[PDB]
Amino acid sequence: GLSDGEWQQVLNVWGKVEADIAGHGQEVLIRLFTGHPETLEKFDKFKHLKTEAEMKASEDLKKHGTVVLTALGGILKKKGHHEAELKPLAQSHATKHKIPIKYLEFISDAIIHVLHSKHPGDFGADAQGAMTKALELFRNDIAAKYKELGFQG
Numbered sequence: 001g002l003s004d005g006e007w008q009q010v011l012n013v014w015g016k017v018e019a020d021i022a023g024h025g026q027e028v029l030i031r032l033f034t035g036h037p038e039t040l041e042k043f044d045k046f047k048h049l050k051t052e053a054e055m056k057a058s059e060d061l062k063k064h065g066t067v068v069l070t071a072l073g074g075i076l077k078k079k080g081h082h083e084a085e086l087k088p089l090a091q092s093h094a095t096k097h098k099i100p101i102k103y104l105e106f107i108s109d110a111i112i113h114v115l116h117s118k119h120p121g122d123f124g125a126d127a128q129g130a131m132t133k134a135l136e137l138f139r140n141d142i143a144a145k146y147k148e149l150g151f152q153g
């Protein structure tokens, strides 16, 4: 897990995200879809988007960006005491959404990318370290739930 100091770094970084949650969410999803087009195919309601201009222009995508990062933020604010919030997330994504576990890695790397893009010079080594640990914890606990269910079997 993370030390108290690391969680503080994580939640201080998350304040940057909360100043524009939609925009961070949009750019994270865009980064995921364009870097990993397979991921787009799992979203029936974004499959129609062919170009990054169309993605950028989609108001529904931004809105969904809010849904996604709200969910993540509430989990991060638990500082690892997240079983109630994380387990249903895991289960929904393994069963209903059919999301391969590796897609969590992809979005983790996208979050780091987008934080640097939007906050150049203001997302230091310490802060990236901490956020990376939190996203690892996140993936690791989701993976445990996936394993229960036999992944995408």
Ligand SMILES: [C-]#N
Residues within 6 Å of the ligand: 064, 068
């Ligand atoms: C989930 N988007």
